[PDB]
């Protein structure tokens, strides 16, 4: 029987509070499909293979070829649009500074590597090589061969090549590193990177003084966390299954279409020339009619599957488009939208037929018990902490920010006063120091 999880209990009690002592920066990876393979079908070739009589008999059936061609054309156009929406969110291409020193962090794993002929980051290549293990097209056999084809099924190249797509991810990375969220809203404004992270710390409710005091510690955690991503990705456990599923689904659907050709669909045989040769023309057309309809219904079914499959891909692309805007281009307050934990920033990484997001999140750790009181009575007037929590280390009372344990003495600046002392529940005798 499945075990849902490890049973855990938290000691809830009035006046009992737990506060972390310090944190843990974690980088989590998220993969989203963006576009699928653009495919087209030669209507006549699939239904009739080099059979003029079948070609003639195909004409009077209707304008399905026009209808089927239009349906697939709409899918192909939509696929290019999906890629454009996700990546083409920057009006201006940005270049990384020649010096790669950013307050003690790399971004070398995610920054494009000049050494490789393909202007791709080291992490991009690991994504590419792992996914391309099961890939399609390659050269596309533009030269003579193969990858199906010769049955009417063709693959159309995407509008944007991989190299240009990598430039977009490169442009986004350069803007985020140098300008933070400013380039997303308007003109890009440079900002020293440690200050930029200090800004994002304030967004999640941590005072910026925490970051500057522990800049070295944070940088080492960030650099080490990035290193684990490469090993986890290069590890056999394939988190890239979602990207792989798109490739398999298209290959599985196309394979089914080829298989359907061999089906006799109720006719005596699945060979067109055999039907005409063995049977007299009066009876032969009857079997031809069944084969044409059977092959047609197979073609119609494939289009419907593709149209349905095109929906969630666009839905995935739409979700990815928001994530790039909401996570990469700025800090997101929405919980769990960009990784697990308090979101700090996100780095986009291009992938074959998709995008991989590297969410940098703030995770508290090493909590400690404390005794708390809703308000402090000093001079007959209740005092409430302006932002922090009222904590007692055991014999004295302090005010500290909710997420980080940074105790401070109670002052009139830390607490605002309102009302008398009797109304509130749980108030506590104490002295509020007045500077």
């Amino acid at each position: 029987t499945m075990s849902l999880g490890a049973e855990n209990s938290v000691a809830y009690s009035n006046n009992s509070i737990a506060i972390p002592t310090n944190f843990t920066i974690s980088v989590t990876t998220e993969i989203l499909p963006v576009s699928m393979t653009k495919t087209s079908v030669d209507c006549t070739m699939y239904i009739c293979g080099d059979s003029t009589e079948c070609s003639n008999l195909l004409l009077q059936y209707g304008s399905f070829c026009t209808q089927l061609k239009r349906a697939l054309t709409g899918i192909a156009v939509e696929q290019d649009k999906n890629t454009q929406e996700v990546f083409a969110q920057v009006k201006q291409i940005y270049k990384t500074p020649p010096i790669k020193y950013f307050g003690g962090f790399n971004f070398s794993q995610i920054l494009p590597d000049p050494s490789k002929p393909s202007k791709r980051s080291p992490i991009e290549d690991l994504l590419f090589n792992k996914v391309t293990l099961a890939d399609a097209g390659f050269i596309k056999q533009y030269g003579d061969c193969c990858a199906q084809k010769f049955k009417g099924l063709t693959v159309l190249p995407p509008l944007l090549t991989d190299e240009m797509i990598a430039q977009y991810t490169s442009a986004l990375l350069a803007g985020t590193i140098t300008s933070g969220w400013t380039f997303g809203a308007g003109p890009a404004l440079q900002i020293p990177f440690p200050m930029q992270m200090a800004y994002r710390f304030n967004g999640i409710g941590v005072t910026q003084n925490v970051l500057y005091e522990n800049q070295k510690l944070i940088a080492n955690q960030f650099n080490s966390a990035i290193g684990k991503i490469q090993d986890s990705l290069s590890s056999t456990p394939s988190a890239l299954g979602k990207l792989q599923d798109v490739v398999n689904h298209n290959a599985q659907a196309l394979n089914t279409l080829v298989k359907q050709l061999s089906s006799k669909f109720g006719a005596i045989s699945s060979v067109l020339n055999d039907i005409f040769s063995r049977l007299d023309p009066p009876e032969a057309e009857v079997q031809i009619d069944r084969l044409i309809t059977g092959r047609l219904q197979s073609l119609q079914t494939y289009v419907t599957q593709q149209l349905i499959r095109a929906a969630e891909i666009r839905a995935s692309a739409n979700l990815a488009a928001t994530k790039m805007s909401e996570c990469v281009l700025g800090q997101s307050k929405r919980v769990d939208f960009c990784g697990k934990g308090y979101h700090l920033m996100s780095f986009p990484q291009s992938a074959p037929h998709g995008v991989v997001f590297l969410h940098v999140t703030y995770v508290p750790a090493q909590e400690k018990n404390f005794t708390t009181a809703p308000a402090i009575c000093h001079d007959g007037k209740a005092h409430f902490p302006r932002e922090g929590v009222f904590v007692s280390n055991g014999t004295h009372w302090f005010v500290t920010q909710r997420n980080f344990y940074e105790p401070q003495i109670i002052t009139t600046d830390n607490t605002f006063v309102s009302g008398n002392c009797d109304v509130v529940i749980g108030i506590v005798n104490n002295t509020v120091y007045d500077p």
Binding site: S40, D42, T44, M45, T66, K69, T73
Partner: protein
């Protein structure tokens, strides 16, 4: 013709396909040699009545 309109908007349109037609027919020899020996029976000296 395909768009069924006398005016066409700017864009890219798939119209038809092109296929190279065969130039000449051809057929290959099973190299058959099992000739019937009925000829020499016709080509015989004596014949029954």
């Amino acid at each position: 013709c395909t768009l069924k309109s006398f005016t066409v908007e700017k864009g890219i349109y798939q119209t038809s396909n092109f296929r190279v037609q065969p130039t000449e027919s051809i057929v290959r020899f099973p190299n058959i040699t099992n000739l019937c020996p009925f000829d020499e029976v016709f080509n015989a000296t004596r014949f029954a009545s």
